[PDB]
Design a protein around this ligand. Structure first.
Ligand SMILES: [Cl-]
Ligand SMILES: [Cl-]
Lengths: 229, 210, 126
Protein backbone atom coordinates (compact mmCIF):
# COMPACT_ATOMS: atom_id res chain seq x y z
CA UNK A 1 0.00 0.00 0.00
CA UNK A 2 2.57 2.55 -1.17
CA UNK A 3 1.35 6.12 -0.71
CA UNK A 4 2.96 9.50 -1.41
CA UNK A 5 1.18 12.64 -0.20
CA UNK A 6 2.52 16.08 -1.16
CA UNK A 7 1.55 19.18 0.81
CA UNK A 8 2.40 22.77 1.70
CA UNK A 9 1.86 24.26 -1.76
CA UNK A 10 0.17 27.65 -2.17
CA UNK A 11 0.69 31.20 -3.43
CA UNK A 12 4.09 32.93 -3.34
CA UNK A 13 5.42 36.21 -4.74
CA UNK A 14 8.67 36.43 -6.79
CA UNK A 15 11.82 36.11 -4.65
CA UNK A 16 9.85 34.59 -1.75
CA UNK A 17 10.29 31.08 -0.32
CA UNK A 18 8.12 27.98 -0.01
CA UNK A 19 8.67 24.53 1.53
CA UNK A 20 6.92 21.43 0.08
CA UNK A 21 6.40 18.03 1.72
CA UNK A 22 6.28 14.47 0.47
CA UNK A 23 5.03 12.18 3.23
CA UNK A 24 5.62 8.56 2.23
CA UNK A 25 4.19 5.34 3.67
CA UNK A 26 3.92 1.63 2.89
CA UNK A 27 7.59 0.88 2.13
CA UNK A 28 11.08 0.76 3.61
CA UNK A 29 11.90 4.46 3.03
CA UNK A 30 15.64 3.72 2.79
CA UNK A 31 15.68 1.37 -0.22
CA UNK A 32 14.15 4.14 -2.34
CA UNK A 33 14.79 7.61 -3.80
CA UNK A 34 12.30 10.49 -3.74
CA UNK A 35 11.96 12.70 -6.83
CA UNK A 36 10.19 15.99 -7.48
CA UNK A 37 8.63 16.38 -10.93
CA UNK A 38 6.73 19.52 -11.92
CA UNK A 39 4.17 20.34 -14.63
CA UNK A 40 3.56 23.96 -15.62
CA UNK A 41 -0.07 24.77 -16.61
CA UNK A 42 -0.61 23.10 -20.02
CA UNK A 43 3.03 22.03 -20.47
CA UNK A 44 4.93 18.71 -20.30
CA UNK A 45 6.76 17.10 -17.37
CA UNK A 46 9.97 18.65 -16.02
CA UNK A 47 12.28 16.84 -13.58
CA UNK A 48 13.39 18.94 -10.60
CA UNK A 49 15.48 16.97 -8.05
CA UNK A 50 15.99 13.79 -6.01
CA UNK A 51 17.24 12.61 -2.61
CA UNK A 52 18.12 9.15 -1.29
CA UNK A 53 17.92 9.11 2.53
CA UNK A 54 21.12 11.13 3.16
CA UNK A 55 22.31 14.50 1.81
CA UNK A 56 25.12 12.73 -0.08
CA UNK A 57 22.70 11.39 -2.69
CA UNK A 58 20.99 14.46 -4.15
CA UNK A 59 21.03 16.40 -7.44
CA UNK A 60 19.08 19.19 -9.15
CA UNK A 61 18.11 20.21 -12.68
CA UNK A 62 20.11 23.17 -14.06
CA UNK A 63 16.93 25.28 -14.23
CA UNK A 64 16.74 25.14 -10.46
CA UNK A 65 20.32 24.61 -9.20
CA UNK A 66 21.24 27.06 -6.44
CA UNK A 67 17.67 28.16 -5.75
CA UNK A 68 16.18 24.90 -4.43
CA UNK A 69 17.35 22.48 -1.73
CA UNK A 70 16.05 18.96 -1.20
CA UNK A 71 16.27 17.33 2.24
CA UNK A 72 14.89 14.34 4.15
CA UNK A 73 13.83 13.18 7.60
CA UNK A 74 14.22 9.38 7.70
CA UNK A 75 12.65 9.57 11.17
CA UNK A 76 9.47 11.24 9.81
CA UNK A 77 9.68 9.39 6.46
CA UNK A 78 9.37 12.66 4.55
CA UNK A 79 11.22 14.59 1.85
CA UNK A 80 11.30 18.40 1.64
CA UNK A 81 11.92 20.78 -1.24
CA UNK A 82 12.95 24.24 -0.04
CA UNK A 83 12.29 26.64 -2.92
CA UNK A 84 14.04 30.05 -2.92
CA UNK A 85 14.34 33.07 -5.25
CA UNK A 86 11.17 31.90 -7.02
CA UNK A 87 10.12 33.31 -10.40
CA UNK A 88 6.92 33.21 -12.49
CA UNK A 89 8.01 30.10 -14.41
CA UNK A 90 8.22 28.07 -11.22
CA UNK A 91 4.41 27.97 -11.33
CA UNK A 92 3.46 24.30 -11.77
CA UNK A 93 1.89 21.28 -10.18
CA UNK A 94 4.72 19.67 -8.18
CA UNK A 95 4.61 15.87 -7.91
CA UNK A 96 6.76 13.61 -5.79
CA UNK A 97 7.60 10.14 -7.10
CA UNK A 98 9.61 7.11 -5.90
CA UNK A 99 12.64 5.71 -7.72
CA UNK A 100 15.45 3.25 -6.92
CA UNK A 101 17.80 4.30 -4.10
CA UNK A 102 20.87 4.10 -6.36
CA UNK A 103 19.10 4.73 -9.66
CA UNK A 104 22.11 6.77 -10.78
CA UNK A 105 24.58 3.93 -10.25
CA UNK A 106 22.20 1.52 -12.04
CA UNK A 107 21.61 3.69 -15.11
CA UNK A 108 22.80 2.16 -18.40
CA UNK A 109 21.80 1.58 -22.04
CA UNK A 110 19.84 -1.47 -20.86
CA UNK A 111 18.57 -0.43 -17.38
CA UNK A 112 16.20 2.35 -16.37
CA UNK A 113 14.07 1.63 -13.31
CA UNK A 114 11.88 4.72 -13.82
CA UNK A 115 9.55 6.26 -11.22
CA UNK A 116 6.99 3.73 -10.01
CA UNK A 117 4.62 5.65 -7.70
CA UNK A 118 3.50 9.28 -7.93
CA UNK A 119 1.52 11.55 -5.62
CA UNK A 120 -1.54 13.54 -6.68
CA UNK A 121 0.42 16.81 -6.82
CA UNK A 122 0.41 20.23 -5.13
CA UNK A 123 -0.18 23.50 -7.00
CA UNK A 124 2.44 26.24 -6.61
CA UNK A 125 1.39 29.61 -7.97
CA UNK A 126 3.91 32.47 -8.11
CA UNK A 127 1.85 35.65 -8.42
CA UNK A 128 3.08 39.17 -9.20
CA UNK A 129 -0.35 40.84 -8.92
CA UNK A 130 -3.78 39.77 -7.68
CA UNK A 131 -7.10 40.76 -9.24
CA UNK A 132 -10.51 39.12 -8.82
CA UNK A 133 -12.52 38.54 -12.06
CA UNK A 134 -15.34 40.47 -13.75
CA UNK A 135 -18.35 38.37 -14.72
CA UNK A 136 -20.43 39.47 -17.72
CA UNK A 137 -23.39 37.39 -19.00
CA UNK A 138 -23.47 35.78 -22.44
CA UNK A 139 -27.21 36.20 -22.97
CA UNK A 140 -29.13 33.55 -25.01
CA UNK A 141 -30.35 34.52 -28.49
CA UNK A 142 -33.97 35.50 -29.12
CA UNK A 143 -33.35 33.73 -32.44
CA UNK A 144 -32.99 30.36 -30.68
CA UNK A 145 -34.20 27.12 -32.30
CA UNK A 146 -37.67 27.18 -30.73
CA UNK A 147 -38.03 23.39 -30.53
CA UNK A 148 -34.24 22.90 -30.42
CA UNK A 149 -31.05 24.09 -28.72
CA UNK A 150 -29.97 27.47 -27.28
CA UNK A 151 -26.58 28.60 -25.93
CA UNK A 152 -25.88 30.89 -22.94
CA UNK A 153 -22.81 31.53 -20.79
CA UNK A 154 -20.53 33.72 -18.67
CA UNK A 155 -17.55 35.78 -19.74
CA UNK A 156 -15.02 35.79 -16.88
CA UNK A 157 -12.65 38.67 -17.46
CA UNK A 158 -9.52 40.41 -16.15
CA UNK A 159 -8.37 38.18 -13.28
CA UNK A 160 -5.00 37.07 -11.94
CA UNK A 161 -3.57 34.60 -11.25
CA UNK A 162 -5.03 31.25 -12.36
CA UNK A 163 -7.18 29.44 -11.59
CA UNK A 164 -10.88 30.25 -11.80
CA UNK A 165 -13.53 27.53 -11.52
CA UNK A 166 -17.00 27.74 -13.08
CA UNK A 167 -20.05 25.60 -12.35
CA UNK A 168 -23.72 25.96 -13.25
CA UNK A 169 -26.60 25.90 -10.74
CA UNK A 170 -24.09 24.87 -8.03
CA UNK A 171 -23.10 21.78 -10.02
CA UNK A 172 -26.66 20.57 -10.64
CA UNK A 173 -26.20 21.25 -14.36
CA UNK A 174 -23.26 19.44 -15.93
CA UNK A 175 -24.60 18.27 -19.29
CA UNK A 176 -23.41 20.23 -22.32
CA UNK A 177 -21.16 22.60 -20.30
CA UNK A 178 -17.99 23.88 -21.97
CA UNK A 179 -15.51 25.84 -19.88
CA UNK A 180 -12.60 27.11 -21.93
CA UNK A 181 -8.85 27.24 -21.16
CA UNK A 182 -7.96 30.69 -19.87
CA UNK A 183 -6.10 32.82 -22.40
CA UNK A 184 -3.67 35.50 -21.25
CA UNK A 185 -4.55 38.90 -22.73
CA UNK A 186 -1.93 41.47 -23.79
CA UNK A 187 -2.94 43.59 -20.77
CA UNK A 188 -1.37 40.81 -18.67
CA UNK A 189 -4.60 39.38 -17.15
CA UNK A 190 -6.39 36.09 -17.91
CA UNK A 191 -9.85 35.72 -19.49
CA UNK A 192 -12.18 32.79 -20.23
CA UNK A 193 -15.77 31.83 -21.10
CA UNK A 194 -18.14 29.14 -19.86
CA UNK A 195 -21.07 28.25 -22.12
CA UNK A 196 -23.85 25.68 -21.84
CA UNK A 197 -26.37 24.46 -24.38
CA UNK A 198 -29.96 24.05 -23.18
CA UNK A 199 -33.49 23.36 -24.50
CA UNK A 200 -34.94 26.68 -25.69
CA UNK A 201 -38.32 25.86 -24.12
CA UNK A 202 -36.67 26.18 -20.68
CA UNK A 203 -35.52 29.81 -21.15
CA UNK A 204 -38.83 31.14 -19.79
CA UNK A 205 -39.29 28.91 -16.74
CA UNK A 206 -35.87 27.48 -15.79
CA UNK A 207 -33.15 29.51 -14.03
CA UNK A 208 -29.48 29.41 -15.02
CA UNK A 209 -26.69 30.74 -12.81
CA UNK A 210 -22.96 30.48 -13.36
CA UNK A 211 -20.80 30.24 -10.24
CA UNK A 212 -17.28 31.66 -10.58
CA UNK A 213 -14.81 31.00 -7.81
CA UNK A 214 -11.45 32.79 -7.72
CA UNK A 215 -9.83 31.20 -4.72
CA UNK A 216 -6.65 33.41 -4.90
CA UNK A 217 -8.67 36.53 -4.00
CA UNK A 218 -11.59 34.91 -2.13
CA UNK A 219 -14.02 36.41 -4.66
CA UNK A 220 -17.01 34.26 -5.62
CA UNK A 221 -19.50 35.62 -8.19
CA UNK A 222 -22.96 34.33 -9.20
CA UNK A 223 -24.64 35.86 -12.26
CA UNK A 224 -28.19 34.95 -13.22
CA UNK A 225 -28.09 34.81 -17.02
CA UNK A 226 -31.37 35.85 -18.61
CA UNK A 227 -32.55 36.65 -22.20
CA UNK A 228 -31.91 40.28 -23.25
CA UNK A 229 -34.37 43.17 -23.93
CA UNK B 1 16.74 20.67 -23.17
CA UNK B 2 14.22 17.80 -23.42
CA UNK B 3 13.98 15.14 -26.16
CA UNK B 4 11.79 15.24 -29.26
CA UNK B 5 8.95 12.74 -29.61
CA UNK B 6 8.28 11.67 -33.19
CA UNK B 7 4.58 12.51 -33.68
CA UNK B 8 3.82 15.46 -31.37
CA UNK B 9 0.16 14.50 -31.68
CA UNK B 10 -1.86 12.02 -33.71
CA UNK B 11 -5.42 10.80 -34.20
CA UNK B 12 -6.44 7.15 -34.50
CA UNK B 13 -9.51 4.89 -34.24
CA UNK B 14 -10.17 2.27 -31.60
CA UNK B 15 -8.39 -0.79 -33.01
CA UNK B 16 -5.43 0.87 -34.78
CA UNK B 17 -1.72 0.23 -34.28
CA UNK B 18 0.08 3.33 -33.00
CA UNK B 19 3.83 4.01 -32.83
CA UNK B 20 5.59 6.85 -30.96
CA UNK B 21 9.36 7.44 -31.34
CA UNK B 22 11.76 9.00 -28.78
CA UNK B 23 14.87 10.74 -30.11
CA UNK B 24 17.71 10.60 -27.56
CA UNK B 25 19.86 13.70 -27.05
CA UNK B 26 22.62 13.09 -29.63
CA UNK B 27 25.18 11.02 -27.67
CA UNK B 28 22.98 9.81 -24.79
CA UNK B 29 22.58 6.02 -24.54
CA UNK B 30 20.06 5.37 -21.81
CA UNK B 31 17.24 2.86 -21.58
CA UNK B 32 13.97 4.74 -21.89
CA UNK B 33 10.96 4.56 -19.60
CA UNK B 34 7.46 5.44 -20.81
CA UNK B 35 4.64 7.16 -18.91
CA UNK B 36 0.95 7.80 -19.60
CA UNK B 37 -0.86 10.89 -18.29
CA UNK B 38 -4.56 11.75 -18.37
CA UNK B 39 -5.90 15.34 -17.89
CA UNK B 40 -5.74 16.23 -14.19
CA UNK B 41 -4.03 13.00 -13.11
CA UNK B 42 -0.51 11.96 -12.09
CA UNK B 43 1.72 10.22 -14.69
CA UNK B 44 1.67 6.41 -14.60
CA UNK B 45 4.65 4.23 -15.52
CA UNK B 46 4.09 1.90 -18.53
CA UNK B 47 7.40 0.57 -19.79
CA UNK B 48 10.77 0.66 -18.06
CA UNK B 49 14.29 -0.39 -19.03
CA UNK B 50 13.32 0.28 -22.70
CA UNK B 51 11.05 -2.74 -23.09
CA UNK B 52 9.89 -4.10 -19.70
CA UNK B 53 6.15 -3.92 -18.96
CA UNK B 54 5.21 -2.46 -15.58
CA UNK B 55 2.74 -4.26 -13.25
CA UNK B 56 -0.90 -4.03 -14.31
CA UNK B 57 -0.07 -2.71 -17.76
CA UNK B 58 -1.93 -4.65 -20.52
CA UNK B 59 0.34 -6.17 -23.16
CA UNK B 60 -1.14 -4.43 -26.19
CA UNK B 61 1.65 -2.01 -25.12
CA UNK B 62 5.26 -2.75 -25.97
CA UNK B 63 8.57 -0.93 -26.02
CA UNK B 64 11.49 -1.40 -28.38
CA UNK B 65 14.71 0.03 -29.77
CA UNK B 66 14.88 1.43 -33.31
CA UNK B 67 18.39 2.32 -34.41
CA UNK B 68 19.53 4.61 -31.59
CA UNK B 69 15.92 5.67 -30.90
CA UNK B 70 13.14 4.13 -28.76
CA UNK B 71 9.61 3.19 -29.78
CA UNK B 72 6.38 2.67 -27.87
CA UNK B 73 3.80 0.61 -29.75
CA UNK B 74 0.14 0.16 -28.83
CA UNK B 75 -0.90 -2.80 -30.97
CA UNK B 76 -4.69 -2.39 -30.64
CA UNK B 77 -5.72 1.07 -29.41
CA UNK B 78 -8.41 0.87 -26.71
CA UNK B 79 -10.77 3.67 -25.52
CA UNK B 80 -8.74 4.08 -22.32
CA UNK B 81 -5.47 4.53 -24.24
CA UNK B 82 -6.17 8.09 -25.39
CA UNK B 83 -3.72 10.14 -23.34
CA UNK B 84 -0.35 11.91 -23.39
CA UNK B 85 2.79 9.75 -23.54
CA UNK B 86 6.20 10.82 -22.26
CA UNK B 87 9.56 9.10 -22.59
CA UNK B 88 12.28 9.47 -19.95
CA UNK B 89 16.09 9.07 -19.71
CA UNK B 90 18.62 9.15 -16.85
CA UNK B 91 21.85 10.53 -18.39
CA UNK B 92 24.51 10.96 -15.68
CA UNK B 93 22.97 12.51 -12.57
CA UNK B 94 20.05 14.25 -14.31
CA UNK B 95 16.66 12.87 -15.30
CA UNK B 96 15.14 14.33 -18.46
CA UNK B 97 11.63 13.72 -19.90
CA UNK B 98 10.49 14.06 -23.52
CA UNK B 99 8.26 16.79 -24.98
CA UNK B 100 5.27 14.42 -24.98
CA UNK B 101 2.80 12.97 -27.49
CA UNK B 102 -0.97 13.45 -27.49
CA UNK B 103 -3.05 10.52 -28.74
CA UNK B 104 -6.50 11.67 -29.81
CA UNK B 105 -9.60 9.81 -31.01
CA UNK B 106 -10.30 9.94 -34.74
CA UNK B 107 -13.96 10.44 -35.51
CA UNK B 108 -16.49 11.39 -38.20
CA UNK B 109 -16.59 15.02 -39.39
CA UNK B 110 -19.11 17.29 -37.62
CA UNK B 111 -19.91 20.90 -38.44
CA UNK B 112 -19.90 23.52 -35.63
CA UNK B 113 -23.04 25.04 -34.13
CA UNK B 114 -22.28 28.74 -34.32
CA UNK B 115 -23.62 31.26 -31.81
CA UNK B 116 -22.69 34.94 -31.58
CA UNK B 117 -23.02 36.94 -28.36
CA UNK B 118 -22.96 40.78 -28.16
CA UNK B 119 -21.37 42.70 -25.21
CA UNK B 120 -23.43 43.01 -22.05
CA UNK B 121 -24.59 46.47 -20.97
CA UNK B 122 -22.82 45.75 -17.65
CA UNK B 123 -19.57 45.50 -19.63
CA UNK B 124 -19.92 48.62 -21.81
CA UNK B 125 -20.15 50.76 -18.65
CA UNK B 126 -16.49 49.84 -18.04
CA UNK B 127 -15.39 51.14 -21.47
CA UNK B 128 -14.70 47.77 -23.17
CA UNK B 129 -16.74 45.63 -25.59
CA UNK B 130 -16.26 41.85 -25.83
CA UNK B 131 -17.98 40.04 -28.72
CA UNK B 132 -17.92 36.23 -28.43
CA UNK B 133 -18.27 33.66 -31.24
CA UNK B 134 -18.86 30.06 -30.07
CA UNK B 135 -18.18 27.07 -32.38
CA UNK B 136 -19.82 24.23 -30.48
CA UNK B 137 -19.22 20.49 -30.88
CA UNK B 138 -17.34 20.12 -34.16
CA UNK B 139 -14.62 17.81 -35.56
CA UNK B 140 -11.88 17.98 -36.61
CA UNK B 141 -10.07 20.76 -34.72
CA UNK B 142 -8.99 22.84 -37.73
CA UNK B 143 -11.44 25.70 -38.32
CA UNK B 144 -11.04 29.32 -39.39
CA UNK B 145 -12.84 32.15 -37.59
CA UNK B 146 -12.98 35.64 -39.14
CA UNK B 147 -14.53 38.82 -37.67
CA UNK B 148 -16.32 41.42 -39.79
CA UNK B 149 -17.40 44.80 -38.38
CA UNK B 150 -19.53 46.52 -41.04
CA UNK B 151 -17.76 44.27 -43.55
CA UNK B 152 -14.27 45.18 -42.33
CA UNK B 153 -12.22 42.03 -41.77
CA UNK B 154 -10.63 42.34 -38.32
CA UNK B 155 -7.06 41.37 -37.43
CA UNK B 156 -4.86 41.53 -34.31
CA UNK B 157 -7.83 42.03 -31.98
CA UNK B 158 -9.22 38.53 -31.39
CA UNK B 159 -8.20 35.48 -29.36
CA UNK B 160 -9.28 31.86 -29.65
CA UNK B 161 -9.59 29.05 -27.12
CA UNK B 162 -10.27 25.36 -27.76
CA UNK B 163 -11.57 22.72 -25.36
CA UNK B 164 -10.06 19.25 -25.25
CA UNK B 165 -12.06 16.44 -26.88
CA UNK B 166 -15.42 15.86 -25.19
CA UNK B 167 -15.40 12.51 -23.38
CA UNK B 168 -18.89 11.66 -24.67
CA UNK B 169 -18.89 12.75 -28.33
CA UNK B 170 -15.15 13.30 -29.05
CA UNK B 171 -15.83 16.76 -30.51
CA UNK B 172 -14.08 20.06 -29.83
CA UNK B 173 -15.53 23.46 -29.01
CA UNK B 174 -13.97 26.84 -29.76
CA UNK B 175 -14.51 30.42 -28.59
CA UNK B 176 -13.29 33.50 -30.41
CA UNK B 177 -13.33 36.83 -28.56
CA UNK B 178 -13.21 40.17 -30.39
CA UNK B 179 -12.14 42.98 -28.03
CA UNK B 180 -12.98 46.63 -28.75
CA UNK B 181 -13.09 49.97 -26.95
CA UNK B 182 -16.64 51.07 -26.12
CA UNK B 183 -15.87 54.09 -28.30
CA UNK B 184 -15.22 51.88 -31.34
CA UNK B 185 -18.01 49.34 -30.72
CA UNK B 186 -20.51 52.17 -30.62
CA UNK B 187 -19.79 53.63 -34.06
CA UNK B 188 -20.59 50.41 -35.98
CA UNK B 189 -23.85 48.50 -36.49
CA UNK B 190 -23.21 45.04 -37.99
CA UNK B 191 -21.10 42.41 -36.19
CA UNK B 192 -20.31 39.05 -37.81
CA UNK B 193 -18.03 36.06 -37.32
CA UNK B 194 -17.64 33.69 -40.27
CA UNK B 195 -16.63 30.06 -39.64
CA UNK B 196 -15.09 27.96 -42.42
CA UNK B 197 -14.66 24.22 -42.11
CA UNK B 198 -13.91 22.59 -45.45
CA UNK B 199 -16.04 23.84 -48.36
CA UNK B 200 -18.77 25.46 -46.26
CA UNK B 201 -18.62 28.79 -44.42
CA UNK B 202 -21.23 29.90 -41.86
CA UNK B 203 -21.71 33.54 -40.79
CA UNK B 204 -23.73 34.56 -37.73
CA UNK B 205 -24.34 38.24 -36.98
CA UNK B 206 -26.33 40.89 -35.09
CA UNK B 207 -27.11 44.60 -35.43
CA UNK B 208 -26.20 46.69 -32.37
CA UNK B 209 -29.44 47.68 -30.62
CA UNK B 210 -31.89 45.18 -32.21
CA UNK C 1 32.08 -0.80 0.65
CA UNK C 2 31.32 -4.17 2.25
CA UNK C 3 29.69 -6.11 -0.62
CA UNK C 4 30.05 -5.58 -4.39
CA UNK C 5 27.78 -7.27 -6.96
CA UNK C 6 28.56 -7.49 -10.70
CA UNK C 7 27.61 -9.52 -13.77
CA UNK C 8 24.31 -7.82 -14.68
CA UNK C 9 23.38 -7.34 -18.34
CA UNK C 10 20.62 -7.76 -20.93
CA UNK C 11 19.49 -11.23 -21.98
CA UNK C 12 16.84 -12.69 -24.28
CA UNK C 13 14.28 -15.07 -22.61
CA UNK C 14 15.69 -18.58 -22.14
CA UNK C 15 19.19 -17.13 -21.84
CA UNK C 16 21.79 -17.30 -19.06
CA UNK C 17 23.87 -15.07 -16.80
CA UNK C 18 26.09 -15.47 -13.75
CA UNK C 19 26.33 -12.82 -11.05
CA UNK C 20 29.23 -12.30 -8.65
CA UNK C 21 29.42 -10.76 -5.20
CA UNK C 22 32.74 -9.93 -3.55
CA UNK C 23 32.89 -9.48 0.25
CA UNK C 24 35.62 -7.71 2.21
CA UNK C 25 36.18 -8.69 5.86
CA UNK C 26 37.26 -12.05 7.28
CA UNK C 27 34.81 -14.35 5.49
CA UNK C 28 34.67 -16.32 8.72
CA UNK C 29 31.94 -14.70 10.83
CA UNK C 30 29.53 -14.69 7.89
CA UNK C 31 26.60 -17.02 8.65
CA UNK C 32 24.54 -16.35 5.51
CA UNK C 33 25.06 -14.81 2.09
CA UNK C 34 22.00 -14.11 -0.04
CA UNK C 35 20.73 -12.80 -3.35
CA UNK C 36 17.68 -10.52 -3.17
CA UNK C 37 16.05 -8.75 -6.11
CA UNK C 38 13.78 -5.75 -6.62
CA UNK C 39 11.63 -4.87 -9.63
CA UNK C 40 9.67 -1.57 -10.10
CA UNK C 41 6.34 -1.69 -8.25
CA UNK C 42 7.22 -4.94 -6.44
CA UNK C 43 8.80 -5.38 -2.98
CA UNK C 44 12.37 -6.60 -2.42
CA UNK C 45 12.33 -10.39 -2.74
CA UNK C 46 14.67 -13.07 -1.35
CA UNK C 47 15.87 -15.25 -4.21
CA UNK C 48 18.60 -17.63 -3.02
CA UNK C 49 20.41 -18.06 0.32
CA UNK C 50 23.50 -19.99 1.40
CA UNK C 51 24.24 -21.04 4.98
CA UNK C 52 28.02 -20.84 4.92
CA UNK C 53 28.82 -23.34 7.67
CA UNK C 54 27.26 -26.32 5.86
CA UNK C 55 26.79 -24.91 2.36
CA UNK C 56 23.02 -25.51 2.48
CA UNK C 57 21.07 -23.52 -0.11
CA UNK C 58 17.58 -21.99 0.14
CA UNK C 59 15.55 -20.88 -2.87
CA UNK C 60 12.41 -18.85 -3.54
CA UNK C 61 9.68 -21.02 -5.09
CA UNK C 62 9.89 -18.83 -8.21
CA UNK C 63 13.55 -19.67 -8.93
CA UNK C 64 13.81 -23.26 -7.61
CA UNK C 65 15.55 -25.24 -10.35
CA UNK C 66 16.62 -22.38 -12.63
CA UNK C 67 19.00 -20.51 -10.28
CA UNK C 68 21.98 -21.85 -8.32
CA UNK C 69 23.85 -20.04 -5.52
CA UNK C 70 27.39 -21.30 -4.87
CA UNK C 71 30.72 -20.40 -3.28
CA UNK C 72 34.01 -21.53 -4.87
CA UNK C 73 37.43 -22.32 -3.37
CA UNK C 74 37.72 -18.65 -2.39
CA UNK C 75 35.79 -17.90 0.79
CA UNK C 76 34.84 -14.39 -0.31
CA UNK C 77 32.82 -14.88 -3.53
CA UNK C 78 29.22 -16.04 -3.86
CA UNK C 79 27.81 -16.53 -7.37
CA UNK C 80 24.26 -16.74 -8.70
CA UNK C 81 23.94 -18.87 -11.83
CA UNK C 82 20.67 -17.89 -13.50
CA UNK C 83 19.40 -20.18 -16.26
CA UNK C 84 16.14 -20.21 -18.26
CA UNK C 85 15.54 -16.49 -17.71
CA UNK C 86 12.03 -15.00 -17.92
CA UNK C 87 10.93 -11.32 -18.33
CA UNK C 88 9.68 -11.60 -14.73
CA UNK C 89 13.31 -12.01 -13.62
CA UNK C 90 13.96 -8.41 -14.69
CA UNK C 91 15.12 -6.61 -11.53
CA UNK C 92 18.12 -5.25 -9.69
CA UNK C 93 19.92 -8.08 -7.92
CA UNK C 94 21.36 -7.38 -4.49
CA UNK C 95 23.78 -9.39 -2.40
CA UNK C 96 23.32 -9.39 1.39
CA UNK C 97 25.23 -10.93 4.31
CA UNK C 98 24.97 -11.24 8.10
CA UNK C 99 27.30 -12.25 10.92
CA UNK C 100 24.40 -13.01 13.27
CA UNK C 101 22.91 -16.52 13.02
CA UNK C 102 19.16 -16.83 12.48
CA UNK C 103 17.02 -20.02 12.21
CA UNK C 104 17.13 -21.23 8.61
CA UNK C 105 13.47 -20.31 7.90
CA UNK C 106 14.31 -16.60 8.19
CA UNK C 107 17.18 -16.88 5.67
CA UNK C 108 15.14 -15.38 2.83
CA UNK C 109 13.79 -12.47 4.92
CA UNK C 110 15.12 -9.03 4.06
CA UNK C 111 15.19 -8.18 7.78
CA UNK C 112 17.94 -10.61 8.75
CA UNK C 113 20.66 -9.03 6.58
CA UNK C 114 22.76 -6.29 8.13
CA UNK C 115 24.36 -4.92 4.96
CA UNK C 116 23.96 -4.93 1.18
CA UNK C 117 25.57 -3.96 -2.12
CA UNK C 118 24.37 -1.22 -4.47
CA UNK C 119 23.08 -4.08 -6.66
CA UNK C 120 23.56 -5.19 -10.27
CA UNK C 121 20.70 -4.62 -12.80
CA UNK C 122 19.27 -7.45 -14.93
CA UNK C 123 16.86 -7.06 -17.86
CA UNK C 124 15.31 -10.08 -19.59
CA UNK C 125 13.66 -8.89 -22.75
CA UNK C 126 13.04 -9.93 -26.35
CL1 LIG D 1 12.92 17.27 -17.72
CL1 LIG E 1 18.55 0.53 -5.11
Amino acid sequence: EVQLVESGGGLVQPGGSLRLSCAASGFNFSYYSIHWVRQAPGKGLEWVAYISSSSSYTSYADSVKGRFTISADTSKNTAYLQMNSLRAEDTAVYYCARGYQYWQYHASWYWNGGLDYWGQGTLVTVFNQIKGPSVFPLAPSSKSTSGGTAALGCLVKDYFPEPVTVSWNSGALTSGVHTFPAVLQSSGLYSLSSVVTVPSSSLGTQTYICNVNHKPSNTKVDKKVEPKS
Amino acid sequence: IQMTQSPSSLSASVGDRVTITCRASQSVSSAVAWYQQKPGKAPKLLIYSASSLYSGVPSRFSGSRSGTDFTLTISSLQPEDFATYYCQQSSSSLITFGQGTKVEIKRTVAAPSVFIFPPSDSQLKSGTASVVCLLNNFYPREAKVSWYVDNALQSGNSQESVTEQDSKDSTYSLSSTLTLSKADYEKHKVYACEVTQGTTSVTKSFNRGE
Amino acid sequence: RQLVESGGGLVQPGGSLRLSCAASGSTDSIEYMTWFRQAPGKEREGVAALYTHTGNTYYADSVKGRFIISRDKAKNMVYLQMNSLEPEDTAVYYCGATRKYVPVRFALDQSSYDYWGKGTPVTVSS
